[PDB]
Amino acid sequence: MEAVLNELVSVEDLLKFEKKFQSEKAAGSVSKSTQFEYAWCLVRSKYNDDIRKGIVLLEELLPKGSKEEQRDYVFYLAVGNYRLKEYEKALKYVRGLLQTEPQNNQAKELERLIDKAMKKDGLL
Amino acid sequence: MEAVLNELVSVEDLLKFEKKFQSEKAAGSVSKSTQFEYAWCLVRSKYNDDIRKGIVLLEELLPKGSKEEQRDYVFYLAVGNYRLKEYEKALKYVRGLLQTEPQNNQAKELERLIDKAMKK
Ligand SMILES: [Cl-]
Ligand SMILES: [Cl-]
């Protein structure tokens, strides 16, 4: 998607699932899917506080996931940590995922981005 | 997000919810939530056939949604039609949504995009 469209869809997404998350948490407890969707929107946000919150929400889901869900959670932990420039954490997550999903070229392109960013720092 | 990142995350999402949708479909019927989530990914895809399928899935959810859900469906119907260059349909959808959500500047910005592309 072009940039302006991507940004406005991102905002609409985040606001919808924030409402849903805040509604459910007001009504007692938050379903696993609602927490994941909100966290997924948070790690794509333009605000760093949002990304940090999405990471926390993904860490809370991680021990309760099926094996397939845990793979999805680790993907977005690497995304969030990469966007925060927590490169060594992101790199550890995506390498672990690639061991169990070797043909995941999305995870591979993410690893390439993380490596490229660690090179331009000089920290690789 | 930057362009390369946005594209690989879009692929990861689509494939994840395609598996969820197809697995629920084979097992009988598909939940509202999975059909929407798959449609949401499809409308954002780089393939026109995907966008068209997302519009179909959204059109099928629309008669049976609540008031709030319908407004969200119409937003993504506007997005998908805009990306397919179906500008008259897209403008109609977003103008309806703006009548009931007047403070929704994301819908407003989408309307400006539709209006720009029509004048291009
Ligand atoms: Cl279809
Ligand atoms: Cl509003």
Numbering used by the authors:
A (entry chain B): 1 to 124
B (entry chain A): 1 to 120
Paper text:
A tetratricopeptide repeat (TPR) motif containing mitochondrial outer membrane protein, mitochondrial fission protein 1 (Fis1), mediates mitochondrial fission by recruiting large cytosolic GTPase, Drp1, to the mitochondrial outer membrane. The cytosolic domain of Fis1 is composed of 6 tight α-helices with two anti-parallel TPR motifs forming a concave hydrophobic surface. Fis1 interaction with Drp1 occurs during cellular stress, but not under physiological conditions, suggesting that cellular signals during stress activate Fis1. Human Fis1 protein contains a single cysteine, Cys41, in the entire protein.
To explore this possibility further, we crystallized and determined the X-ray structures of the WT and three phosphorylation mimic-mutants of Fis1: Thr34Asp Fis1, Thr34Glu Fis1 and Tyr38Glu Fis1. Consistently, we observed that the first 30 residues including the α1 helix were missing from the structure providing strong evidence that the α1 helix undergoes significant conformational change and is potentially disordered in the phosphorylated forms, whereas it was intact in the WT. Unlike phosphorylation mimic mutants, the WT Fis1 crystallized as a non-covalent dimer. We rationalized that the α1-helix and N-terminus structure are intact in WT Fis1, making Cys41 unavailable for disulfide bridge formation and hence WT Fis1 could not form a covalent dimer. When we modeled the structure of Fis1 WT dimer using the Thr34Asp Fis1 covalent dimer with modeled the missing unstructured first 30 residues, the Fis1 covalent WT dimer perfectly fitted the SAXS curve for WT Fis1 dimer. The modeled WT Fis1 covalent dimer fitted both the P1 and P2 symmetry enforced ab initio envelops independently calculated from the experimental SAXS curve. However, it is also possible that the differences of WT Fis1 dimers in solution and crystals may represent different types of dimers that enable interactions with different protein partners.
